[PDB]
Design a protein around this nucleic acid. Structure first.
Lengths: 51, 119, 123, 56
RNA sequence: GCUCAACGGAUAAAAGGUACUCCGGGGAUAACAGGCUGAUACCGCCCAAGAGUUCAUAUCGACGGCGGUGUUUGGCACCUCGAUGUCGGCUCAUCACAUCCUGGGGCUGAAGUAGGUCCCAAGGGUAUGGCUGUUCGCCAUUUAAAGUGGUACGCGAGCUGGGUUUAGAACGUCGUGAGACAGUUCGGUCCCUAUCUGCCGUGGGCGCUGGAGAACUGAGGGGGGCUGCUCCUAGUACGAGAGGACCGGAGUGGACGCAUCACUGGUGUUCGGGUUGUCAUGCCAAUGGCACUGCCCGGUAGCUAAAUGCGGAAGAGAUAAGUGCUGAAAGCAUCUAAGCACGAAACUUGCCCCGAGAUGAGUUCUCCCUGACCCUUUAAGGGUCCUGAAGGAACGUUGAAGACGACGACGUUGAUAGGCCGGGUGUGUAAGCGCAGCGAUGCGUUGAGCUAACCGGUACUAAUGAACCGUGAGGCUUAACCU
RNA sequence: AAUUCCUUGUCGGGUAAGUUCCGACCUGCACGAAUGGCGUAAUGAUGGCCAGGCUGUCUCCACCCGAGACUCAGUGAAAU
RNA sequence: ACACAGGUGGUCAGGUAGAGAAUACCAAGGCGCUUGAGAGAACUCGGGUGAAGGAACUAGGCAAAAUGGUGCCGUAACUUC
RNA sequence: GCUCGCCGGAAGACCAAGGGUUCCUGUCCAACGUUAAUCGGGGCAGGGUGAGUCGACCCCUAAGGCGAGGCCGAAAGGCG
RNA sequence: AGGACCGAACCGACUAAUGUUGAAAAAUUAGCGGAUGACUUGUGGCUGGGGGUGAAAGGCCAAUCAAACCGGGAGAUAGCU
């Protein structure tokens, strides 16, 4: 983007940091979602652990 | 490089060379001595001596071949009726080159080429 | 004399009909391939239900070249087309169970004994 | 493509030092007519090596 | 009475675009490249908490510290604005080592194979493609390896002009607009006959101390130096198995270089044939000219690669990192201080080529010259007559030598070139005549005719008797012999 | 996308490998309805990509024919 | 600006092959283009041919190479027919 | 003078436009012709262009120009 | 019948090469587009510079065009070289 290598490098570092943070966050959400999906039942009366 | 090759190009294309040598051979056997430049004269021998050699034996086939290489019936007729019996005993070398100086217009080394027994 | 982008006919019943050479194996900066040397090829045309599909990358050994080979006496055997025999990518052994067309004496070695055994004529 | 300093007359003469012509070393005398001529060429009267090769 | 606030106030009164541009200047001043410096970039080093099951230092290394290079982006404006052409690509390179591979070695968290890291080493080698104008990058498949850099991020008076970077046009955006965009997309003139240095070749003159023809020595200079795979040792050493050597030997390849045409081929407009249209030789028949050699099919010699021979080495000397023996300083230890040994594609040779202008001009063998006199400034002096050697040059016929000079063969006591004779090769059964057929055409004579550069011969032609240049015993001083 | 900077967005086709192309998706920096929106047979010395034939464009250059370049004779410049 | 590979309107229109004023060779007619001669190096221009491969070249099949006439059989998507 | 090659819907033949003696004969090579030159479209001298019917002039008009008087415009002048 | 198709004269100039002190102050060779039309061409005329003309490029207006050329103000001015 910028004519300056230092500014280009700074912007690239920021985007890279955001992408890594996003990847980690997404991986956490996917894992959290999968665990929740398995633990929670279908919502039908058949899936039971206590009556 | 032109290792073991023969034939002077003489700054002309092949068709021009063939036609020029045909004309020059006709002129030489017609007049019995002609003046031309030294390389052209040295190259003219290789065309006019086989014609005489061919002309040594009179036959219809030989006359047609001589006609194919000269395109002048008078020239063919002279070759077979005179030049063949005249040179009937020679083992080649029916011409003679005599260097005659340099041309005024372009300083080309000229020469006279004549039949050996002209006189 | 096979190099890159050369189309070849297939001499075995492995299922491929027309392959293209994409590398000449066995050495840096190598230009051509005679007979009996591996090349890496891609399959550009195959029969409907064969052992190989169109677009697979695998090895092959050249058995016939239009430039031909030369023998110690000075003779030369020239063929009308360039033909190869498909080989496995790891074992380098023939996929098909039959060979089509003749081959030459340059192939008789422990590596291609199967090919010369199956060949209909060994020139 | 072009010079940066004018070459001298000295340099001009040095370059032209090999441009000189060479005069003919010796002429030949015809054995019959006695006149001089270039070696292996016919004399100005039409003789060559004694015999009269071309009329006039 | 003036936020004349741009406050010593140009007027009471004034904003933009120029890539359609244009002039006078500045490297006083920016972009490229060079210069200084090194924040930034890259590569090292100092301390060692920690990761490594235990153990800092096998490999990494936090918090901190000290440098090297000029190497990215910069800082400055010292060079150039009376022009220093710029990204990438093609061709051609050359240097550095902070070494990508091959070579030598220490440690290893090194059983073996295969690795990690560091030290020494620049001799050689160090991909082809898909995508984009790309450098860079990702990907496919090889390779022993696909190095990092310098050279105006080498190279446009060598090539390109796709991107960028003029004038045309459009899209998104900004502006009322002219227009503008490190936003994009279509199209868009790359000049120079080389004077000097440099470099690749090749000559002329003179020198080397009388002149000449050969053959050398070698001070010095250049070229070349890469490596795979398979087999034997040996499925041995090692390992529980899977797997699998060091050292040493043999064969066959890839790339590069030199040579050659004997083989496989290309060219072969100078050889032969097939055939279309037309014109000419009175006409038939047969030829010849033109149509890219009219279009083709073959192909001699020569030149050539794709074709086939050869090469990189082995060996020796001295070494780098490294391994040592003996041995004190320092009763021990210690590769070093005295002394001795080993050690790599690096150095010097060994292989090939140039090479005494090597002015330090060298060495060896052989050939040629053994006359009379004058003059004045009396000396390495000048002049006349006689003499012209050995050898060279010139001229001619020429060459698988060659731009031209040069180099090589031959010049009548001659095969140097052309022609001629015979053979070989190439083309493919010529012309004329006869027979069969109404005819196109076929068959016989006939594997005929023609045949360049090839091979073996042959003075038939051209290579003249001469003439020209070059001389006529070769300076001085010492030393050793000779009489 | 003649329009998307991030961007070679992601998926599919073609290729062994496709920053271009084609077909979708919509997170439209910053499309859009006569400074016209979206298609469209035919047409174009229009822009991009792929395939068959063909090839010295290339791997990798080699030979041959002429016109210059070179030598000889005659005339005889120029930029700087 | 030249005895300049440029520019210039109208008229005549032969033979053979060809659809033809294209194209090739000729007639009537007119020219060989005002420096030549050698040699047959690199390199430059305009061409011919090429083993094996067929776009691997390159920004891009740029340029070369290739197709090419007449009669007949047959001819797809899409379409404003 | 004899061969060879090139154009031949032109590189042949006749005009208009344009040029203005370059046309033909004798003579000369100093300067012009990219070389030599006895040759020339070069120098010098002489000769050569014949019309009731070809073309121009003449009679007639198109686009357009000039324009008696006239209208308009500081003057020059514009339109008709 | 057609701003229809293939293709010469004629008009134009898309690509490459050569030439860039050229044969030429934009052309030559091999290809290329139109070729009964919004075509092309000869002769004469008309539109004049802040004006003309433009199937529109600020193109062209005598090898000169974001305001022609010639004469004059004129030895413009130039804190610049």
């Amino acid at each position: 983007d910028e004519r300056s290598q230092h500014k280009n490098k700074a912007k690239a570092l920021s985007v890279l940091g955001a992408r890594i943070h996003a990847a980690e966050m997404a991986k956490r959400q996917q894992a959290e979602a999968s665990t929740r999906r398995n633990l929670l039942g279908s919502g039908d009366r058949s899936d039971r652990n206590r009556t | 490089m032109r290792h073991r090759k023969s034939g002077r190009q003489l700054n002309r294309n092949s068709s021009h060379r063939q036609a020029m040598f045909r004309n020059m051979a006709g002129s030489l056997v017609r007049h019995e001595i002609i003046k031309t430049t030294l390389p052209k004269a040295k190259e003219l021998r290789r065309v006019v001596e086989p014609l005489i050699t061919l002309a040594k034996t009179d036959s219809v086939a030989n006359r047609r071949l001589a006609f194919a290489r000269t395109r002048d019936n008078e020239i063919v007729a002279k070759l077979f009726n005179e030049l063949g019996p005249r040179f009937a005993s020679r083992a080649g070398g029916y011409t003679r080159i005599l260097k005659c100086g340099f041309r005024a217009g372009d300083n080309a080394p000229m020469a006279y080429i004549e039949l050996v027994d002209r006189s | 004399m096979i190099q890159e982008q050369t189309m070849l006919n297939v001499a075995d019943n492995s299922g491929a009909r027309r392959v293209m050479c994409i590398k000449v194996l066995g050495g840096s900066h190598r230009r051509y391939a005679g007979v009996g040397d591996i090349i890496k090829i891609t399959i550009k045309e195959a029969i409907p239900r064969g052992k190989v599909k169109k677009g697979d990358v695998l090895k092959a050994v050249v058995v016939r070249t239009k430039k031909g080979v030369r023998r110690p006496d000075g003779s030369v055997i020239r063929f009308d087309g360039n033909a190869c025999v498909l080989l496995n990518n790891n074992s380098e052994q023939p996929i098909g169970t039959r060979i089509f067309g003749p081959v030459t004496r340059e192939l008789r070695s422990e590596k291609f004994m199967k090919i010369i055994s199956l060949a209909p004529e060994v020139l | 493509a072009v010079q940066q300093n004018k070459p001298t007359r000295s340099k001009r003469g040095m370059r032209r030092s090999h441009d000189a012509l060479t005069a003919v070393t010796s002429l030949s005398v015809d054995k019959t007519s006695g006149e001089k001529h270039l070696r292996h060429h016919i004399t100005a009267d039409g003789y060559y090596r004694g015999r009269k090769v071309i009329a006039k």
